[PDB]
Amino acid sequence: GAMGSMERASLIQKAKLAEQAERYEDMAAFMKGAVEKGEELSCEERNLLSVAYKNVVGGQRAAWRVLSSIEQKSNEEGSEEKGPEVREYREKVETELQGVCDTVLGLLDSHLIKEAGDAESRVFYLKMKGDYYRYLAEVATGDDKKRIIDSARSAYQEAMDISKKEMPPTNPIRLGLALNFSVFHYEIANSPEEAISLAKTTFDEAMADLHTLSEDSYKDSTLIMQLLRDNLTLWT
């Protein structure tokens, strides 16, 4: 790999510089190199990895949605024929998005998840596995769509089981996992009632645990609780 000759600490240092410069493709490549050094990742390092790829795939997903919309319009009644270009370019962006998802999933499988033993790291990585299968599911249309969806579900479910046993209801990772699993139910699995029930129960159980928290932790938790509330207001 092109990062094989750079020190682990230098890769982390440059990942932080890339974030400051909003160079998220660079940031992702640096953190991929850090992961490939083979040592487990600290809490801060895990969040550098997630920030980098979240931003990269976020831009690809937004672009895919623009192109997919143009493509759907082109196939309505009365739309003039413009050739294969829209499909081709949507396919180009889709393939690059799938490549990024495959890269993240490959890092999780080789070998982040199997070495992660603490609840905070294991839940974090399983949530990530669910997230990137969900992004694959957003663009899937063929023979493997159902297996892609079930792979996202299974990863989210394993993470949920651990988080409920090992973390308090206000833990930001637990809350973000539940938020995203709820979105999976609503957007991918055609299960809006499950999405709503999960978001409500997660919100209510966190509300009842806020009294245990410091001011700084209270801020961290209520920020994510508001996102659950935003979705409930959108969905109901």
Partner: peptide, 6 residues
């Protein structure tokens, strides 16, 4: 709007 995720 869009669904919130984190």
């Amino acid at each position: 709007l869009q669904n919130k995720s984190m």
